[PDB]
Nucleic acid binder design. Structure first.
Lengths: 151, 136, 37, 122
RNA sequence: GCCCGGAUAGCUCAGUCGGUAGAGCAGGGGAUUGAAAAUCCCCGUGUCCUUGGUUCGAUUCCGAGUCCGGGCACC
RNA sequence: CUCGAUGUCGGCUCGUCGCAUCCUGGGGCUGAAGAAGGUCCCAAGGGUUGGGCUGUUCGCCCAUUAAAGCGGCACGCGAGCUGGGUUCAGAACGUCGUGAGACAGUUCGGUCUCUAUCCGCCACGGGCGCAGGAGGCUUGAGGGGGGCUCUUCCUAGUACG
RNA sequence: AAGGUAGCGAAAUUCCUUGUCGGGUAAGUUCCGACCUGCACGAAAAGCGUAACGACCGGAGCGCUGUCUCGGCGAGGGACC
RNA sequence: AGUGGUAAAGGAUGUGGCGCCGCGAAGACAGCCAGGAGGUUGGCUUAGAAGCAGCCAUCCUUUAAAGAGUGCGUAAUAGC
């Protein structure tokens, strides 16, 4: 709101009567959030594959855990990729060519730039030297337990 | 593709002209400068068309998955019984009567073909019914 | 934008510009910078 | 005077007034942990207690032995090789340390603290 | 890096030359006991992993993703 | 063509061209505010670090870096080195073989020569000449050398907001 | 014909192998230690171990040193007149 | 165009050539002028369609001859 009217715009609220939420979802945010599939570390060979499917958060060896988000999806759907692994080493044989994929970094921040990123249940787990963001339900299969939609 | 329950292993190689022409619905795709064409590629077109066409009212056919192409080995050195069966397809060479319907009613069908074959694999042309044909 | 090929105009009224054997499509939308020469 | 691989001396909150640097922190083409410079290293020598450890920081260049040639044709050499360990920013490591004065240092400047800190005889 | 593989309920797991979805254990209701184990009937829960194609309809036959799959590699 | 003979690896040292250019810039494009990315066309100019382990080039890892490219030339280089290498006999076992002997299973050692003739390159001179015989100062067509780049600070957080 | 015991194991036998853990280490397919699903160990061509002794072969680390960051000048011998 | 002086898929208001289409001097097209007409005003959605928000509508009067409105759009609407 403050970004629409540019400060010059105030308006609060309260309630008129306990409803039922209607039938539609009030977001729910676009571009699904990229979640992890287990604790470990960021693997160049792991974050390289599905990298064009949106943006990334952490880097490498960045070793996060389950439920922790590590970027946003190119669409609205949500997934739980994985990699460390990054695999695999190594040789011989043999050589010499070739290839040497790189990778872009954050994309990091802010807080302040990641908090409002949530929507359903992505507690922005913060620390006295770090700031993470995971879903109310780490385990993937666990999330489906609460959804479970109709009827 | 489909060249099911064949009978033999392999053909041979040549090419030059044949007997495709008619019409058969008025939505036609005719080859012109080819030879054999992957049963697959073929299905490709099949798809292309099928999908474009609001995805329903049927197209028809034309050639067949006809012969068995062999690159034999995998990349060895050469002297195998020339065995190995591997890619099956059409053998159409002089601008052939390739026939595809649907009920597009238009340059819509056009497009369908356009891509289907533009794709497929050769210098080719398309049209409709131009000089009927009388049989016994 | 460019491409050693393609170009079948676009911006609904995207222009087929003849310039130096330069198959260059000109429009009113950067999205169409069609340089295929 | 300089070195890449190095058994150097320090005297800050050192694990031991000694660490081995890899190289020079300057213009990508090291070859000189030089007087009044800033570079990279890990520990070589021991460390009673101390929050230091057997890790690696970077830091700034003190002494040398093979010509401290100054702008004012001030000249000197100490039969000693050592610098002060840094914490990120540069902000030095320890509370104090065993050594003293002379241009080159302060001159590099960024480390006044080192500056007033190591003053007197030694 | 080519080459196969598994993806099915709460967790471990099969499918006429498609058209139907299952035991097991968790599990709550019993039969049972003196009460309980064990055992025997019953409930329930179904994304049949995401796409594109074939068909009247595909969990299944095909295309792609998907953890997953055994393997390729002297100058 | 080559078996009247063409030294195969790895590395060294001196490298030379190439662009599908990595850092460089010039750029239109953005889902481009700024910044920063990312998306193609132009252009090789210079530039295009140390170690670790591995006989391995490839590779994975440490530390940076503007950056730490792909590759052409018998995977450049023995008439210029190196020679761990895989590849003469040993002996080793692990493995086949009735065993003789064997395994592109492996592991320990394992006698790389070179007085240049030619054209070629690096230099330095002797000629004979650019129609008087001379001492010395020039101008260059044309050819050669070097054209990189950091980070900080300057206008810097008013551009975007 | 029974079907490998005891000890022993990724080893002068593990190709999947830079196996996996651990240690060493800024980093290590290197070796030491573990594990042991032993591509293909085993007692008599010995098996596990075993001090002293090896121009044994391999892995650390202190010491020292133009050896290495290029080396730089120097003397003696040919090279050259 | 330097094609001469190797190349395909395929792309195109290239160049020139057909053998063809628009000419209501009831004087043409790009360039021009002005009006861009009243029922056109839900059908849902109307927070808005009252052509310029989505599931089709295919009628009428009426003259510059008539847009069941091809298009810049938000809150309909209002303007091009």
């Amino acid at each position: 709101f403050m970004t629409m009217t540019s400060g010059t715009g105030l308006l609060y609220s309260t309630f008129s009567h306990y409803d039922d939420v209607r039938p539609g979802e009030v977001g729910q945010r676009q571009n699904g959030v990229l979640i992890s599939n287990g604790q470990g570390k960021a693997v160049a060979f792991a974050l390289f594959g599905l990298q064009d499917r949106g943006k990334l958060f952490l880097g490498h060896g960045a070793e996060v855990y389950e439920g922790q988000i590590i970027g946003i999806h190119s669409r609205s759907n949500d997934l739980t990729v994985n990699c460390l692994t990054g695999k695999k080493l190594t040789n011989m044989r043999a050589s010499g060519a070739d290839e040497a994929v790189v990778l872009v970094p954050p994309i990091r921040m802010t807080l302040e730039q990641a908090l409002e990123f949530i929507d359903d249940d992505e507690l922005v787990e913060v620390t006295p030297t770090s700031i993470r963001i995971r879903k109310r339900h780490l385990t993937e299969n666990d999330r489906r337990r609460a959804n479970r939609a109709p009827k | 593709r489909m060249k099911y329950r064949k009978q033999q292993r392999g053909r041979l190689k040549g090419a030059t002209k044949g007997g495709d022409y008619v019409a058969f619905g008025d939505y036609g795709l005719v080859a012109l400068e080819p030879a054999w064409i992957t049963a697959q590629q073929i299905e490709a077109a099949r798809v292309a068309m099928v999908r474009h066409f609001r995805r329903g009212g049927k197209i028809f056919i034309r050639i067949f998955p006809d012969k068995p192409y062999t690159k034999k080995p995998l990349e060895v050195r050469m002297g195998k019984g020339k065995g190995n069966v591997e890619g099956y397809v059409a053998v159409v060479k002089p601008g052939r009567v390739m026939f595809e319907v649907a009920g597009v009613t238009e340059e819509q069908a056009m497009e369908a073909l356009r891509i289907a074959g533009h794709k497929l694999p050769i210098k080719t042309k398309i049209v409709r019914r131009d000089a009927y044909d009388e049989a016994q | 934008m460019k491409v050693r090929a393609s170009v079948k105009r676009i911006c609904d009224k995207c222009k087929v510009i003849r310039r130096h054997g330069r198959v260059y499509v000109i429009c009113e939308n950067p999205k169409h910078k069609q340089r295929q020469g | 005077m300089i070195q890449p691989q190095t058994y150097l001396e320090v005297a800050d909150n050192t694990g031991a007034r000694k660490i081995m640097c890899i190289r020079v922190l300057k213009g990508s083409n090291a070859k000189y942990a030089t007087v009044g410079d800033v570079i990279v290293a890990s520990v070589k020598e021991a460390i009673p207690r101390g929050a230091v450890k057997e890790g690696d920081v970077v830091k700034a260049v003190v002494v040398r032995t093979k010509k401290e040639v100054k702008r004012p044709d001030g000249s000197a050499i100490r039969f000693d090789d050592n610098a002060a360990v840094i914490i990120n920013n540069q902000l030095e490591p320890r509370g104090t340390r065993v050594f003293g004065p002379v241009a080159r240092e302060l001159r590099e400047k960024g480390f006044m603290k080192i500056v007033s800190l190591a003053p007197e005889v030694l």
